[PDB]
Design a protein around this ligand. Structure first.
Ligand code: ARG
Ligand code: MG
Ligand code: MG
Ligand code: MG
Ligand code: MG
Ligand code: MG
Ligand code: MG
Ligand code: MG
Ligand code: MG
Ligand code: MG
Ligand code: MG
Ligand code: MG
Ligand code: MG
Ligand code: MG
Ligand code: MG
Ligand code: MG
Ligand code: MG
Ligand code: MG
Ligand code: MG
Ligand code: MG
Ligand code: MG
Ligand code: MG
Ligand code: MG
Ligand code: MG
Ligand code: MG
Ligand code: MG
Ligand code: MG
Ligand code: MG
Ligand code: MG
Ligand code: MG
Ligand code: MG
Ligand code: MG
Ligand code: MG
Ligand code: MG
Ligand code: MG
Ligand code: MG
Ligand code: MG
Ligand code: MG
Ligand code: MG
Ligand code: MG
Ligand code: MG
Ligand code: MG
Ligand code: MG
Ligand code: MG
Ligand code: MG
Ligand code: MG
Ligand code: MG
Ligand code: MG
Ligand code: MG
Ligand code: MG
Ligand code: MG
Ligand code: MG
Ligand code: MG
Ligand code: MG
Ligand code: MG
Ligand code: MG
Ligand code: MG
Ligand code: MG
Ligand code: MG
Ligand code: MG
Ligand code: MG
Ligand code: MG
Ligand code: MG
Ligand code: MG
Ligand code: MG
Ligand code: MG
Ligand code: MG
Ligand code: MG
Ligand code: MG
Ligand code: MG
Ligand code: MG
Ligand code: MG
Ligand code: MG
Ligand code: MG
Ligand code: MG
Ligand code: MG
Ligand code: MG
Ligand code: MG
Ligand code: MG
Ligand code: MG
Ligand code: MG
Ligand code: MG
Ligand code: MG
Ligand code: MG
Ligand code: MG
Ligand code: MG
Ligand code: MG
Ligand code: MG
Ligand code: MG
Ligand code: MG
Ligand code: MG
Ligand code: MG
Ligand code: MG
Ligand code: MG
Ligand code: MG
Ligand code: MG
Ligand code: MG
Ligand code: MG
Ligand code: MG
Ligand code: MG
Ligand code: MG
Ligand code: MG
Ligand code: MG
Ligand code: MG
Ligand code: MG
Ligand code: MG
Ligand code: MG
Ligand code: MG
Ligand code: MG
Ligand code: MG
Ligand code: MG
Ligand code: MG
Ligand code: MG
Ligand code: MG
Ligand code: MG
Ligand code: MG
Ligand code: MG
Ligand code: MG
Ligand code: MG
Ligand code: MG
Ligand code: MG
Ligand code: MG
Ligand code: MG
Ligand code: MG
Ligand code: MG
Ligand code: MG
Ligand code: MG
Ligand code: MG
Ligand code: MG
Ligand code: MG
Ligand code: MG
Ligand code: MG
Ligand code: MG
Ligand code: MG
Ligand code: MG
Ligand code: MG
Ligand code: MG
Ligand code: MG
Ligand code: MG
Ligand code: MG
Ligand code: MG
Ligand code: MG
Ligand code: MG
Ligand code: MG
Ligand code: MG
Ligand code: MG
Ligand code: MG
Ligand code: MG
Ligand code: MG
Ligand code: MG
Ligand code: MG
Ligand code: MG
Ligand code: MG
Ligand code: MG
Ligand code: MG
Ligand code: MG
Ligand code: MG
Ligand code: MG
Ligand code: MG
Ligand code: MG
Ligand code: MG
Ligand code: MG
Ligand code: MG
Ligand code: MG
Ligand code: MG
Ligand code: MG
Ligand code: MG
Ligand code: MG
Ligand code: MG
Ligand code: MG
Ligand code: MG
Ligand code: MG
Ligand code: MG
Ligand code: MG
Ligand code: MG
Ligand code: MG
Ligand code: MG
Ligand code: MG
Ligand code: MG
Ligand code: MG
Ligand code: MG
Ligand code: MG
Ligand code: MG
Ligand code: MG
Ligand code: MG
Ligand code: MG
Ligand code: MG
Ligand code: MG
Ligand code: MG
Ligand code: MG
Ligand code: MG
Ligand code: MG
Ligand code: MG
Ligand code: MG
Ligand code: MG
Ligand code: MG
Ligand code: MG
Ligand code: MG
Ligand code: MG
Lengths: 141, 59, 77, 203, 110
RNA sequence: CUGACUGGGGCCUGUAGAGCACUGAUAGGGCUAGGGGGCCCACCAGCCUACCAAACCCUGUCAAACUCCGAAGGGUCCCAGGUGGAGCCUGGGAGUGAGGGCGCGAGCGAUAACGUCCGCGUCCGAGCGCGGGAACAACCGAGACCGCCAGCUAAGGCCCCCAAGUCUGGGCUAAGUGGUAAAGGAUGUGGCGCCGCGAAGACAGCCAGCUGGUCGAGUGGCGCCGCGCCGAAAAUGAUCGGGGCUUAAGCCCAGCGCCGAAGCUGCGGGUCUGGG
RNA sequence: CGCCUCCUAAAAGGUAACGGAGGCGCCCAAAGGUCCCCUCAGGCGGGACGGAAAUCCGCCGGAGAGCGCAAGGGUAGAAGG
RNA sequence: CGAUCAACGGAUAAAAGUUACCCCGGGGAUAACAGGCUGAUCUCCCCCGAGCGUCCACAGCGGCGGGGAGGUUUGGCACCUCGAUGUCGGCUCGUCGCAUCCUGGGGCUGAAGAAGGUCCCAAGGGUUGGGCUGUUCGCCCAUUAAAGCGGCACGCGAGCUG
RNA sequence: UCCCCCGUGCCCAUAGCGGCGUGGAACCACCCGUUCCCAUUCCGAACACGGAAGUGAAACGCGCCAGCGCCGAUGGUACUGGGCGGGCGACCGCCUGGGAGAGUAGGUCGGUGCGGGGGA
């Protein structure tokens, strides 16, 4: 599932999740979108699980755009060790997601078909979501 | 014109540079009123500690 | 559990030592640097480690000459 | 068609205060003028949702004027997803670059095979006279297979409109659909660990 | 995208301005040969001399020597004595060398 | 008179933010060397690809060790205000070299710890002196020389315990919510919108066989905002500090008044410093 | 466990953790001084043996090359040849 | 000029181990027991509804993922106690929690009946005797309405055992 | 002082790439030779010398075109010194002073100082 093919550096400092999204805040590919309402590190396991939910809903048809990618390595020290002895090991990758970003877009599917698929996928995510459709506001960006 | 500055909130717990400002203004006790010549240098301090003080324009 | 890291080097305390408008004497060090971030200008020599030092008594001046880089000058008094 | 919108001049009032009053701040400008203006949010929304950056908007100013403008840029609140600023471009007799809607007339053969039409450009940038603004531009996608595509080159243009994008620019394509049959083989794809771009005597 | 000519010209001139003297720069064309002494501190030419302005004769080498003396005579009259020889892109040789040796003969200091 | 701090002025900087021009990452599409695959060939090539995909281009993005950009600030010199238990110089005497909470910026940890390691600030340390927070070193208020059965205020408060309003005006809440919790769920309640469908007779139904008919006024969804409901299981006896409170003694908006400290004032006194 | 480079380091300097990553314990008699010349990587096209790349020719190419070795700063108006 | 004085401000020109036979001075500045804080781990309850259940997403189940509660496990931290907080298991004596093993009361059932399944309410009482092993735990015998799980310094050594 | 050219600086892409056009009287250039000074890891290509038949073809100078490159507001916003509120938090707001980046409108096929040679 979703992870970088290679990187310059193996481990990354945790950083912070302050503010509204940097960009990617408007619909840009499909007809309908799923937008994050609160900040989080969204894991590769979640993204894929959120995707599979949608394709499973469509059965055949539709197109799924995944507009977030987990390039941030998640670190964790082995079980029951003490503090110190360096930094932990990489156990997965997450995508940093701040409020306002369109995470998923669907296209080529009926409205009620998009509403449900994005809702279902919405349940696989660790945050509050909002479903949105393409506007002229999006077109003007 | 002159400035009538009055210390009305304690400097305790505020940065040492704000405490220094009061010293430049010459304000040492609460509720103390001092009258100062409205120059830019005097005004800067009076504005640095504007959350501790009450200013009224006189003369 | 161990690490192969843990090393680092003594800080070299580089940078401009006298800014524009500051009076210097002959020999005063003006810029400490790696390579030529600043270049020797009027009345200013350069040492073997790119060290900029005042050649005369006077006042420092900086001038940014675009693609020519930045220059440090000492104006005689 | 062509829509109308009341606009008012604004001075030193705070953009924050205006937006709280229900009024959406903006600016009016061209090569000749530049005026601080504000519209009503709810009214402007009604217009813009259809007008967009595609149709002319006449701005009924309180001084008595009525300038015919295009919206050139809209600023969104990235958190709340709402407009926060409007750029009204005061149009004049000279030609002007702008975005013109596309209608993809026809049902592609790829679509009959289960495929999906991805409308890459839902409009196209065009240099044209203000008097010469088309309501849309038709495009035949009926001959599109999985996976074929059209470009701005294949766009047959109305009189007086000139392409402002590369003719190489892809505009629409028909792509294969999601399939559950793909899930099994997509899940069976085992992934090797991310190699490291190295530093030093390795890099 | 510079040329060997431009770089050669630049490289030797930067070296001259560094010493901060007045510079005796010399242009040397196919027919003629000009020379000016410049204050790069002020961006000002102080004394001029050329074959074209002296209406001089035949052999370009022998001509140069004459414009050299010409420059020096006009020079000392202005209080200028010491100066630095900007050989430009030209190798110190022949025509240019002769111009210099003439300036020296005329009492110019370099 | 040079000090902290402050006003103006120059110079240094690469963070916040943002960006993709470099180093890398990256989704999709386009174009297109390379393979893979199929019709096709050994005679050397073709051709089609709903295959994996280089470089390039487009749309959209990610980065402490990326930066085409780049603040607020910060450092320093100059002139000026600043006479302060300020500053500078020589010397005598130390103590300290286990810090801690809190706020903000990071790393480490698990976007754990009354966690740990730095940074800027603060307080406790040494203010376990005083008012508030039920109680409580470090949260709010405030720096306690002594005296007074005088006055004004700070935080916090004004139904009774308990000093001062059962104070005034507008609104919400019916859950004792207030008086500890999440995804998610819901004809709770009030309030703003937005679509439909309706006296070209809607909706509910009451009928004859989805039509009508029958009545005669609305009806059916979306979404947003305020306040509430569920989700809500733990070990000695219960409780918001208690009693008790429901057009509040709860919550939101706007006011006037009071109460309240060792802060401020009045009066008296001490000591030191400065000036007569 | 000393030394060098980058990050952490919060745009002066400095700043810790058994924090993230790499290097040094040499070398060069020219790889040094000076004077005088010269300008790269890479891309497309052309050329016997000659190939992705040997040497040659042309056009484009601000520096992405090179600078003994890590990294950063610097640098062709040379510190590179 | 002779330094891997590299523990790199370099004790001597010259140096390894062991102590359950041990001792003194100190520390809760620092480990082991318990508590505390935390809740990764653990136990439990939910959200979503792919899919199973002849038929039928929800009788019974619940892919991939999501949110919590508890404070019984193993841990992390090192905050009171190192001028002493005695540490497993058993015996004895209990008392509480309820996420209820039984008995009482319910809804749904893929509930004919009888008997089960699953969830809801309910802490009043009850919850056996044995063999193995120090064991807690667990396996096994024979029964039973049932042979519940946890807290109380893993309750209880100025109460016993050892 | 105005016009053109040759020098030499400054500003440091609004000055650049590409396209087109124009200039040889003068200046510059290419050009004609390689005797002589001097030169080629081979080559008079370059450097250099002696010249003046030719040509402005290459170069260079001067103009014009906004396809690319470069400059780029106003407005809004992010962020923030300082002062305050909110949440159990991740985090979220208010006041005051400062205020980006992207993008939009638009700008640009240079400006200028000194000295010479020529012209009015
Ligand atoms: N004017 C300022 N400096 N504002 C500070 C901005 C950050 C502040 N904590 C906020 O939430 O708003
Ligand atoms: Mg995580
Ligand atoms: Mg982590
Ligand atoms: Mg352990
Ligand atoms: Mg660690
Ligand atoms: Mg770790
Ligand atoms: Mg993971
Ligand atoms: Mg995001
Ligand atoms: Mg969710
Ligand atoms: Mg954009
Ligand atoms: Mg205070
Ligand atoms: Mg005080
Ligand atoms: Mg305080
Ligand atoms: Mg301050
Ligand atoms: Mg300060
Ligand atoms: Mg006082
Ligand atoms: Mg006051
Ligand atoms: Mg291992
Ligand atoms: Mg190691
Ligand atoms: Mg150091
Ligand atoms: Mg050193
Ligand atoms: Mg250090
Ligand atoms: Mg360092
Ligand atoms: Mg510097
Ligand atoms: Mg030197
Ligand atoms: Mg200057
Ligand atoms: Mg100068
Ligand atoms: Mg609206
Ligand atoms: Mg000048
Ligand atoms: Mg003074
Ligand atoms: Mg001073
Ligand atoms: Mg000073
Ligand atoms: Mg200042
Ligand atoms: Mg300053
Ligand atoms: Mg950032
Ligand atoms: Mg990039
Ligand atoms: Mg872009
Ligand atoms: Mg970031
Ligand atoms: Mg970023
Ligand atoms: Mg950095
Ligand atoms: Mg950065
Ligand atoms: Mg800029
Ligand atoms: Mg710029
Ligand atoms: Mg600044
Ligand atoms: Mg400052
Ligand atoms: Mg002064
Ligand atoms: Mg003192
Ligand atoms: Mg002192
Ligand atoms: Mg002393
Ligand atoms: Mg003494
Ligand atoms: Mg003594
Ligand atoms: Mg000590
Ligand atoms: Mg010590
Ligand atoms: Mg210490
Ligand atoms: Mg300590
Ligand atoms: Mg410490
Ligand atoms: Mg705060
Ligand atoms: Mg912190
Ligand atoms: Mg960290
Ligand atoms: Mg968690
Ligand atoms: Mg601590
Ligand atoms: Mg903490
Ligand atoms: Mg912390
Ligand atoms: Mg502290
Ligand atoms: Mg102490
Ligand atoms: Mg206290
Ligand atoms: Mg104190
Ligand atoms: Mg109290
Ligand atoms: Mg107290
Ligand atoms: Mg009390
Ligand atoms: Mg008390
Ligand atoms: Mg307390
Ligand atoms: Mg406390
Ligand atoms: Mg009173
Ligand atoms: Mg009050
Ligand atoms: Mg009370
Ligand atoms: Mg009240
Ligand atoms: Mg009582
Ligand atoms: Mg009372
Ligand atoms: Mg009342
Ligand atoms: Mg209840
Ligand atoms: Mg209650
Ligand atoms: Mg309650
Ligand atoms: Mg909720
Ligand atoms: Mg509701
Ligand atoms: Mg009904
Ligand atoms: Mg509740
Ligand atoms: Mg009321
Ligand atoms: Mg007092
Ligand atoms: Mg008195
Ligand atoms: Mg005294
Ligand atoms: Mg050493
Ligand atoms: Mg640093
Ligand atoms: Mg620094
Ligand atoms: Mg740094
Ligand atoms: Mg700093
Ligand atoms: Mg220093
Ligand atoms: Mg050599
Ligand atoms: Mg070397
Ligand atoms: Mg060398
Ligand atoms: Mg080549
Ligand atoms: Mg070739
Ligand atoms: Mg060949
Ligand atoms: Mg070849
Ligand atoms: Mg390089
Ligand atoms: Mg190496
Ligand atoms: Mg020795
Ligand atoms: Mg040592
Ligand atoms: Mg030793
Ligand atoms: Mg010794
Ligand atoms: Mg020794
Ligand atoms: Mg010895
Ligand atoms: Mg030894
Ligand atoms: Mg030894
Ligand atoms: Mg022992
Ligand atoms: Mg023994
Ligand atoms: Mg023994
Ligand atoms: Mg034994
Ligand atoms: Mg003994
Ligand atoms: Mg002992
Ligand atoms: Mg301890
Ligand atoms: Mg210790
Ligand atoms: Mg120990
Ligand atoms: Mg212990
Ligand atoms: Mg332990
Ligand atoms: Mg115990
Ligand atoms: Mg313990
Ligand atoms: Mg205890
Ligand atoms: Mg606890
Ligand atoms: Mg957990
Ligand atoms: Mg928990
Ligand atoms: Mg639950
Ligand atoms: Mg089935
Ligand atoms: Mg069924
Ligand atoms: Mg199904
Ligand atoms: Mg279920
Ligand atoms: Mg599962
Ligand atoms: Mg969770
Ligand atoms: Mg869990
Ligand atoms: Mg516990
Ligand atoms: Mg416990
Ligand atoms: Mg432990
Ligand atoms: Mg524990
Ligand atoms: Mg531990
Ligand atoms: Mg401890
Ligand atoms: Mg312990
Ligand atoms: Mg302990
Ligand atoms: Mg500690
Ligand atoms: Mg004790
Ligand atoms: Mg102990
Ligand atoms: Mg005792
Ligand atoms: Mg004792
Ligand atoms: Mg129960
Ligand atoms: Mg029963
Ligand atoms: Mg029962
Ligand atoms: Mg039955
Ligand atoms: Mg049956
Ligand atoms: Mg039942
Ligand atoms: Mg019971
Ligand atoms: Mg009981
Ligand atoms: Mg029981
Ligand atoms: Mg027995
Ligand atoms: Mg066992
Ligand atoms: Mg039985
Ligand atoms: Mg039974
Ligand atoms: Mg038994
Ligand atoms: Mg026990
Ligand atoms: Mg027990
Ligand atoms: Mg005993
Ligand atoms: Mg025992
Ligand atoms: Mg006991
Ligand atoms: Mg016991
Ligand atoms: Mg006992
Ligand atoms: Mg024994
Ligand atoms: Mg010129
Ligand atoms: Mg051109
Ligand atoms: Mg021509
Ligand atoms: Mg001619
Ligand atoms: Mg002619
Ligand atoms: Mg010969
Ligand atoms: Mg001869
Ligand atoms: Mg020779
Ligand atoms: Mg020749
Ligand atoms: Mg030549
Ligand atoms: Mg030509
Ligand atoms: Mg030339
Ligand atoms: Mg030309
Ligand atoms: Mg133009
Ligand atoms: Mg811009
Ligand atoms: Mg602006
Ligand atoms: Mg702040
Ligand atoms: Mg904010
Ligand atoms: Mg602000
Ligand atoms: Mg402002
Ligand atoms: Mg800008
Ligand atoms: Mg241009
Ligand atoms: Mg010029
Ligand atoms: Mg002139
Ligand atoms: Mg003239």
């Amino acid at each position: 599932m979703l992870m970088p093919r290679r990187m310059k550096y193996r481990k990354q400092q945790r950083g912070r999740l302050k503010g509204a999204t940097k960009g990617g805040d408007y619909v840009a590919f499909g007809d309908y979108g799923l937008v994050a309402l609160e900040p989080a590190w969204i894991t590769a396991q979640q993204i894929e699980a959120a995707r599979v939910a949608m394709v499973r809903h469509f059965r055949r048809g539709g197109k799924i755009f995944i507009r977030i990618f987990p390039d941030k390595p998640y670190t964790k020290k082995p079980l029951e060790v003490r503090m110190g002895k360096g930094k932990g090991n990489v156990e997965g990758y997450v995508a940093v997601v701040k409020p306002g970003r369109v995470m998923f877009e669907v296209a080529g599917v009926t409205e009620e078909q998009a509403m449900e698929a994005l809702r279902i996928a919405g349940h696989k995510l660790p945050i509050k979501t909002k479903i949105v459709r393409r506007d002229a506001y999006d077109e003007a960006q | 014109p002159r400035l009538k500055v009055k210390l009305v909130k304690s400097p305790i717990g505020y940065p040492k540079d704000q405490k220094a400002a009061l010293k430049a203004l010459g304000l040492r006790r609460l509720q103390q009123e001092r009258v100062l010549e409205d120059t830019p240098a005097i005004r800067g301090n009076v504005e640095k500690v504007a959350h501790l003080v009450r200013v009224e324009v006189v003369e | 559990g161990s690490t192969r890291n843990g090393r680092d080097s003594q800080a070299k305390r580089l940078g401009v030592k006298r800014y524009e408008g500051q009076v210097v004497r002959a020999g005063n060090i003006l810029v400490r640097q790696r390579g030529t971030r600043f270049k020797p200008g009027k009345n200013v020599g350069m040492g073997r480690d790119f060290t900029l030092f005042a050649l005369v008594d006077g006042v420092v001046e900086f001038q940014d000459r675009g693609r020519l880089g930045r220059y440090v000058h000492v104006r005689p008094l | 068609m062509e829509y109308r919108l009341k606009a008012y001049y604004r001075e030193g009032e705070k953009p924050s205060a205006l937006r709280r009053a229900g009024k959406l701040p903006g600016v009016m400008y061209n090569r000749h003028l530049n005026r601080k203006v504000y519209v009503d949010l709810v009214e402007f929304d009604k217009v813009f949702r259809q007008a967009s950056i595609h149709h002319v908007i006449v701005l009924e100013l309180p001084d008595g004027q009525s300038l015919p403008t295009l919206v050139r840029q809209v600023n969104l609140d990235k958190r709340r997803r709402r407009p926060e600023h409007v750029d009204f471009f005061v149009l004049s007799d000279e030609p002007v670059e702008m975005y013109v809607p596309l209608r993809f007339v026809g049902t592609p053969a790829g679509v009959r095979a289960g495929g999906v039409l991805q409308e890459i450009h839902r409009d196209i940038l065009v240099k044209v006279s203000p008097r010469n603004i088309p309501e849309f531009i038709e495009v035949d996608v009926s001959g599109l297979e999985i996976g074929d595509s059209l470009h701005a080159s294949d766009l047959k243009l109305p009189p007086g409109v000139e392409l402002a994008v590369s003719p190489e620019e892809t505009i629409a394509a028909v792509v294969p659909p999601e399939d559950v049959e793909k899930l099994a083989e997509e899940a069976a794809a085992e992934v090797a660990e991310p190699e490291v771009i190295k530093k030093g005597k390795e890099e | 995208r510079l040329t060997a000519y431009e770089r050669r010209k630049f490289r030797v001139r930067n070296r001259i301005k560094r010493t901060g003297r007045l510079r005796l720069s010399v242009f040397r064309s196919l027919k003629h040969i000009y020379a000016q002494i410049i204050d790069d501190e002020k961006g000002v030419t102080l004394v001029s001399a050329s074959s074209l302005a002296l209406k001089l004769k035949g052999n370009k080498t022998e001509v140069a020597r004459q414009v050299g003396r010409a420059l020096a005579e006009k020079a000392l009259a202005l209080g200028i004595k010491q100066v630095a020889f900007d050989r430009g892109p030209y190798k110190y040789h022949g025509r240019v060398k002769a111009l210099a040796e003439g300036a020296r003969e005329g009492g110019l200091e370099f």
